[PDB]
């Protein structure tokens, strides 16, 4: 038991291209998407493992 809960949720991700489609089908255990993210602005970035404040 982790956080007193034994069941485990495993999340997957993908990136839909423009003008394309995604198709889900299931009959159980479906943690369905309710929202998604449009990638509106690429660039140059990074992920910083730091502790400081802003």
């Amino acid at each position: 038991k982790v956080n007193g809960q034994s069941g485990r949720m495993e999340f997957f991700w993908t990136i839909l291209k423009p003008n394309d489609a995604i198709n889900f089908e299931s009959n159980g255990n479906f943690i369905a998407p309710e929202y998604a993210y449009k990638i509106v602005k690429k660039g140059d970035s990074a992920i910083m493992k730091s502790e400081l404040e802003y």
């Binding site: 990074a46 992920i47 910083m48 493992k49």
Partner: protein
């Protein structure tokens, strides 16, 4: 130094020179006075400026270690990445340190070369009208005023002056 001028056959540097790394100190009946040999100082200033620019622009594509995250079962590829970035940073630190050291060496020896070359420039004009006092000075066997010294500075000393 490597050429023997600084801290060598010339004892030490003059506190009284402020406008050049090298220069003259003439003493005649018209007084004493320091003068800066500007041209040689400009050669040296160009040398150092180009050296600094070289140091800045020669390592302007060094290496940028961007962070990559890995899971618990990618220890091998994570260690590959880790020691790769570590090795690149080590080799570039090595390069920076070697450049700094070798340039300090060459620059100190360049200044020594310039002092010795100026002493030689004066001697090669003054060939027999003067005598070396052994520490950077030249005793004039004739009487010569401030324009004599100026002709020595800008390099046009006229050898026909009777000297006994």
């Amino acid at each position: 130094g490597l050429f023997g001028a600084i801290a060598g056959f010339i004892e030490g540097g003059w506190q009284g020179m402020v406008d050049g790394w090298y220069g003259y100190h003439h003493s005649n009946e018209q007084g004493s006075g320091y003068a800066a040999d500007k041209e040689s100082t400009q050669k040296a200033i160009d040398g150092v400026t180009n050296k600094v620019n070289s140091i800045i622009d020669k390592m302007n594509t060094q290496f940028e270690a961007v962070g990559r995250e890995f899971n618990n079962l990618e220890r091998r590829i994570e260690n590959l990445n880790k020691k790769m970035e570590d090795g690149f940073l080590d080799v570039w630190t090595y390069n920076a340190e070697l450049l700094v050291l070798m340039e300090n060496e060459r620059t100190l020896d360049f200044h020594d070369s310039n002092v010795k070359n100026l002493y030689d420039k004066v001697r090669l004009q003054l060939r027999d009208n003067a005598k070396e006092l052994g520490n950077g000075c030249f005793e004039f066997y004739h009487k010569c005023d401030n324009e004599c010294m100026e002709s020595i500075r800008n390099g046009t000393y006229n050898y026909p002056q009777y000297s006994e």
